[PDB]
Design a protein around this ligand. Structure first.
Ligand SMILES: Cc1cc([C@@H]2CN(C(=O)c3ccc(F)c(Br)c3)CC(F)(F)C2)n2ncnc2n1
Ligand SMILES: [Mg+2]
Ligand SMILES: [Zn+2]
Length: 343
C-alpha cells in the first residue's frame, strides 16, 4: 500500500529545510518542475514550515501529512492539469511570499488561504474546459452550469471533501469564525482561477493599481488575492524559454485531445483546440500579449520587485515571434517525402 508507507516517512522522518531542496529554491529563476515528483509532498511541508504556518496555526503534523497526500492523489494525469501543475503554482505562491513581502498587504490568514488554494485549485481536473462540460452534459454541468465556473466549483468541492475526510481536516481546531473565513477565502480564490472571472474584474484591478493599494480597503484585499492567484496559475510563463516551450507542448496536447472528443460528438471545437486549424505561434503570441502580459504588468505596478516577472513574460512573447517561421516547412521534410500531402 504505497500511500501508507509514504505517509509514515513524511510524518516520522521530519520536515527537511527549504535550502536542502535546492540552493536556488526561493528565487524566481528556479523551475519547480525540475523537482522529482516523489519529493514534492515533502517540499510542500518544507514551504509551509518556512512560511511558519505550521507553528502559527498549530497545524497537527499527522493531519497535515495526510492532507497533502490526499490532495496530491486527487489530481489525475492529463498532460498539463496534473499534480505537478498544482505543485508549481503553489511554489510560485511561496516565491511571492519570500520575494515580495505580502505581509505588508495581506492578513496572515489570507496568505495561508492563498497557498492552500493553490494546492487544491485544479483538483480532479479531467483535461477539459468548462464549455466541454456543458456541451457534453457531464455530471459537473448538471450540478453547476447554472452558476458558471463549472470546473472551479468542482475543484473547491473536492477541496472541501478532502477536508471532511476523517484525519484530514487541517483547520478543525480553528475557531468557528476562522474556519468559516478560511473556507470562504478558498472559495473566492479558487473561483478566481476561471479566466472569465479574471477578465470580468480586469478593470477593477486596473483601477486599484491607479489609485494605489489601500490596506484598509477590504475590497482591495479580495482583488489582490485574485490577481495573485492568477499570477501563480500562469507562473510557468515567468520562467525560461525551455519551460515555456515545454508547457505549450503539454497544453496543446490537452487542448487537442478535447477537440478530438468534440469532433467525435459532432461539434466544432474552438480554433485553439482543433489540431487541424490551430496555429500555435499566433495563439501563444495572442495569449501572451492579451492575457499574460497585462497580468504581470499589473503585478509590477503594485509591487516594483515583480518587474523581472513581467520582463521574462515579454521576452518569452518575443521569442515566439522569433521562432514562428519554423512552423513553415521549407525544403522537403526530414524523410524527403511528400507522402504527408495525401493526408
Ligand atoms: C501557463 C499557461 C496556461 C495556459 C492556459 C490558459 N487557458 C486558456 O483558456 C487559454 C486562453 C486563451 C488562449 F489563447 C489560450 Br492558447 C489558452 C486556460 C488553461 F487551459 F487552464 C491554462 N496557457 N495557454 C497557453 N499558454 C499557456 N500557459
Ligand atoms: Mg483551473
Ligand atoms: Zn491551474
Amino acid at each position: 500500500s504505497a500511500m501508507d508507507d509514504e505517509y509514515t516517512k513524511l510524518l516520522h522522518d521530519g520536515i527537511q529545510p527549504v535550502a536542502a531542496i535546492d540552493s536556488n529554491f526561493a528565487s524566481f529563476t528556479y523551475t519547480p518542475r525540475s523537482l522529482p515528483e516523489d519529493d514534492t509532498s515533502m517540499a510542500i511541508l518544507s514551504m509551509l514550515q518556512d512560511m511558519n504556518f505550521i507553528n502559527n496555526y498549530k497545524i497537527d503534523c499527522p493531519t497535515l501529512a495526510r492532507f497533502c497526500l490526499m490532495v496530491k492523489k486527487g489530481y489525475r494525469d492529463p498532460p498539463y492539469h496534473n499534480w505537478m501543475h498544482a505543485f508549481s503554482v503553489s511554489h510560485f505562491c511561496y516565491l511571492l511570499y519570500k520575494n515580495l513581502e505580502l505581509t505588508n498587504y495581506l492578513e496572515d490568514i489570507e496568505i495561508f488561504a492563498l497557498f492552500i488554494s493553490c494546492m487544491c485549485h485544479d483538483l480532479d481536473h479531467r483535461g477539459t474546459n468548462n464549455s466541454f462540460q456543458v456541451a457534453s452534459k457531464s455530471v459537473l454541468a448538471a450540478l453547476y452550469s447554472s452558476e458558471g465556473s463549472v470546473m472551479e466549483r468542482h475543484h473547491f468541492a473536492q477541496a472541501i471533501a478532502i477536508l471532511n475526510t476523517h484525519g484530514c481536516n487541517i483547520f478543525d481546531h480553528f475557531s468557528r469564525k476562522d474556519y468559516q473565513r478560511m473556507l470562504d477565502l478558498m472559495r473566492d480564490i479558487i473561483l478566481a482561477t476561471d479566466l472569465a472571472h479574471h477578465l470580468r474584474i480586469f478593470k477593477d484591478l486596473q483601477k486599484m493599481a491607479e489609485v494605489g493599494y489601500d490596506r484598509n480597503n477590504k475590497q482591495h484585499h479580495r482583488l489582490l488575492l485574485c490577481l495573485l492567484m492568477t499570477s501563480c496559475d500562469l507562473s510557468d510563463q515567468t520562467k525560461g524559454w525551455k519551460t515555456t516551450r515545454k508547457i505549450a507542448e503539454l497544453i496543446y496536447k490537452e487542448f487537442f485531445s478535447q477537440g478530438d472528443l468534440e469532433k467525435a460528438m459532432g461539434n466544432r471545437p474552438m480554433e485553439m483546440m482543433d489540431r487541424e486549424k490551430a496555429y500555435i505561434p499566433e495563439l501563444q503570441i495572442s495569449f501572451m500579449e492579451h492575457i499574460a502580459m497585462p497580468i504581470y504588468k499589473l503585478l509590477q505596478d503594485l509591487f516594483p520587485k515583480a518587474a523581472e516577472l513581467y520582463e521574462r513574460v515579454a521576452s518569452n512573447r518575443e521569442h515566439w515571434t522569433k521562432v514562428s517561421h519554423k512552423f513553415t516547412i521549407r525544403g522537403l521534410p526530414s524523410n524527403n517525402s511528400l507522402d504527408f500531402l495525401d493526408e
